[model samples]
Target: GTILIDLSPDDKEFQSVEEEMQSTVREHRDGGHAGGIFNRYNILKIQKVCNKKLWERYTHRRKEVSEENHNHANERMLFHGSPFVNAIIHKGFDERHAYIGGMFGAGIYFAENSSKSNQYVYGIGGGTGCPVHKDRSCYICHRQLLFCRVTLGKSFLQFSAHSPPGHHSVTGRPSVNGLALAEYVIYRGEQAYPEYLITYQIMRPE
Candidate 1:
């Protein structure tokens, strides 16, 4: 199977992701002016990621290690934003290359809230540059995001400065004191599969 497939407007996968991304954007609960002000254009493209080798490892992590040892794989589909999504597309999410000072420790981070992930997009987070829409006029205004399947086996439901020894994932709830949004972190690279890449424009709300 090919590693990447660009979904077309008529494709079910495209429609599913189009609405899903829209839903996440509409359901944002940031409680700030920016949430009310900034909005995303309809998704321009959805690239389905189908890396067979990486998916094999993710399934094994879930079926063998997660379910076998913990009695539940706790798989979740969540969002991730990165400057170099191609790096993830090629190598999967290697935790050693993850941003070290993340609020949830030194692991790959995921967000239940799309706006949380949106913050890491090119112009918003001061990312090195936009990988898509390389033309000067569109680069700063376009953004990209990934929808990932995360295996959260035996999650630690609290904050820690380091990866918790026995937990496969860490969850931070927005209801808790430290975080404004819910976030999930997994320490192992195989614990996740990058499922979709979404490209859209950042626009002021009408």
Candidate 2:
């Protein structure tokens, strides 16, 4: 919930973030492998019922979506897939909010009006008594889910269930205290905001 100290990709210690209020520092914080709202066990339940066959639909549909994501930006799929696979997924109703599921666990990231926010949610309910239990617990999501809402200075935030923990996917790393699972960033062009690297931390539950 609170950080012992903010860290960098290579473990470099720098000035306090407070010390540089109007700047960005490529900060990193670990959200954790099975931390947040739900744990690994929760995800296991969903998988028990909705086997690989169940996900086939999203897998197929996602192909076209991912294709559009890459095709739109001349960007190549650098990460390939997750460093590890975890039955991860994507879901959303509007451009502003979205959900993701995998080994890292379930989570929701969205642009609620002018604010940038994200929070973890339930498991996939893999081993379920009913199919709805499986659907209710699931959290896989798509990237383009937020594309339309991304304005010139709207800010950038996304998620991956596992791998490269505690690091900004583009140019950041995990903090010393936790594994980085999420991050918030702004690019150089948006001069009006200096540059921003705001991150949140997980906990031991004192």
Candidate 3:
């Protein structure tokens, strides 16, 4: 299932393949992916959502969030467009950020914007940090949304973008397209957190 292509740099052609990829990964994150690039392939889909609140409906203590769709839709949830957001369930952390999981388990992530009153929401395909369907490929799903918290307190997993190694957009800076997903590894057991689970999808990057 491996699809290889030229990730190499180019000084010859215009908009080289790598350039387009970098652009997609970079710009696709814009407007909070107002455009569904991930959905471009229909890999993930929305099943059931409570417009009253932008959460997956806290019928926790289960195993998975009940799928609202019968597996034929593609549209990552947009929180602002929704009404009420669900309450925070249990929170976990790896090292870099916090991991907010459902009392049962929802395949989603809760990213809150802090312009003034916590606005917006986005998700990765992991069902809010659930360790299901991570069949190796998920490890490299860098193009997906990656959010994080300021610190590992009351935090949640994130789809953060970072820059290449020793690349320009290094620390002490930020970018809408200059950086890429932050380097992360699933818990390597190197911290003192309230808890850590083998199913949690976060790790230390520093």
Candidate 4:
């Protein structure tokens, strides 16, 4: 019930996705350049939720939210840096495992800027084996980044951990929230689709 689509360099979406990724991770000239340098090598797309019910729920919710928000969709491809790439891909985001003490509460967190997410990509030593699918070989122990399709329907702009009523998600505005970058919080696992997984290595200056 898995659909981990390995994207070839020649794949039609390879170039575009890579560019967006680099722009988010790279510093200066439009790159977020939040923390450090990175060299990305592999990308995998999670085509869909394996469970039929889950997929239906997500799609149905997306449609409802889109209409409620005046047809805005409000969908965004966001970054989530985590070491639990394999578990997440298999079962999706579980609020129970998400930190309850997070600045924005016990919800799944994502970032618009890779730099912000990179700081949390704490895993290392990837050449051991493929983290998600063992059939494939993972040459380098790269830090994995999740590029997710999130439905931020009727987002509530706030700085508190309290998830307000009647809001699908919470948004921490940069300047207003005293944050250098924006952080997105979603309360439900169905609110996001783990679209892509990027295998990358942190670069260092000589």
Candidate 5:
């Protein structure tokens, strides 16, 4: 069986270029200090171009996958959330920070129990880290990084002992595991204490 696909008539490349030009105009109109203005324009242009390429790649991949029938079933799983839960109540430590550490443990758990599928967990730190001297409550940001290692190791053991029978016995497939991604953002705020901006992206396939 053959499937015919029609390409969109719109010139994606041209539209991308036009959007970049429009963005550049908007920046100039917004009128910040002229210093480094050109550099910012170039950076935005590059980002737009890269995004366009990625979009094209994703569309192509989707089409290809849809057309194929190799008798194989594959699933992709994504998980994302903040490391902190309640900043006001958890006053001593950020729940989001703890969550990031927990994610590390979960990654290890998934790796051991779902070895047949590709899995990855990533952490991004955004507007989270605070100065060490800002009180012990803010300490969770840094503490979580340390805890990540401990929890991940422990999770591996738990997964191995308790995973469902045959969970690790799948055939003709390779599995991936562990802390596949991690990042943190820290900067100084008005209080002379560093702050962080973090984000996370995780994926698993079955």
Candidate 6:
């Protein structure tokens, strides 16, 4: 997505606006106020950079990869193992933050690669099914499996299913949505600027 507004150092208005915004952000982050002034500004900045067309594109592409009447009977298993609790926890951490964090970190790395270039981000990969076990040791037993591959700049970050095959365990399938990924990326990028206030909205599952 192309941003019409440029905040280059050469432009006085851009520099002043950015500085003021950064100051307000710093004030809020420093615990001066509690009304989420910085967070709202960050959200507005994200909205400004990411327009409706880009948002629609992300949503449409994400739907294509999500499970909806998808069958796993024909899917081939590349690897299989017994469910481990630590492995499950690690997978959750990766799915929750690392996957998206790595993607945006890759974006930042690539953004500095060239003076004029924007990378394309995407999610790919599938998951395996878990089987029931006699010990009932799995936390996520008999749950569907899912994974993703995000490509940005010249790097790719993959999130693989950690549940054991043919055994029920906790943490069946991962749910890292596209919108969440975008927000994560923006949040990370904004963290470099300490002056701007950054607030996040938490949504509950329906």
Q: Candidate 3: global Cα-lDDT?
A: 0.21
In angstroms, the error of model 6 at 116 is 33
The superposed Cα distance between candidate 6 and the true structure at residue 170, in angstroms, equals 11
Cα lDDT of model 4 by residue, 1-206, tens digit: 54666677677676677777666653422242333444433343322225455456567878977887888768998988776766777777776537566777788889887766765565322222345543112334455777888899888897433357877888977754342566899888778877777776555433
1 or 2, greater by lDDT: 1
User: Which regions of candidate 6 are displaced past 4 Å?
Assistant: 4-48, 66-206
| lDDT winner between candidates 1 and 5 | 1
Candidate 3 Cα misplacement greater than 4 A, ranges: 1-41, 51-134, 138-206
Query: Candidate 4 has what TM-score?
Result: 0.74
Model 3 per-residue lDDT tens digits across residues 63-177: 1211322321222211111111222212222222322342212222221221101112223221232135433223222222212211111112233222233221111112343
* C-alpha lDDT of candidate 1 relative to the true structure: 0.71
Task: Estimate the TM-score of every prediction.
Answer: 0.80, 0.21, 0.19, 0.74, 0.19, 0.17
Q: Order of candidates by TM-score, top first? A: 1, 4, 2, 5, 3, 6
Q: Mind sharing the TM-score for model 3?
A: 0.19
Model 1 alpha-carbon drift over 4 Å, by segment: 26-37, 68-70, 127-140, 159-162, 176-181
Off by over 4 Å in 4: 26-54, 123-140, 159-162, 176-180
- lDDT minimum window of 10 residues, candidate 2: 40-49
lDDT of 1 by residue, 84-176 (tens): 676887788885547677777788888876766765655334343345543222424656789999988878897433457767788986664
Give candidate 6's root-mean-square deviation (CA, Å): 20.6
Question: Which ten residues in a row are the worst by lDDT in model 5?
Answer: 186-195
| Residue-level lDDT for 166 in candidate 1 | 69
In order, the Cα lDDT scores of the candidates are 0.71, 0.23, 0.21, 0.65, 0.21, 0.22
What would the per-residue lDDT of candidate 6 be over residues 12-95, giving only the tens digit for each residue? 644544343333222212231212112212212211122344334434433432332142111111111112212321222123
lDDT (Cα, 0-100) at 5 in candidate 4: 63
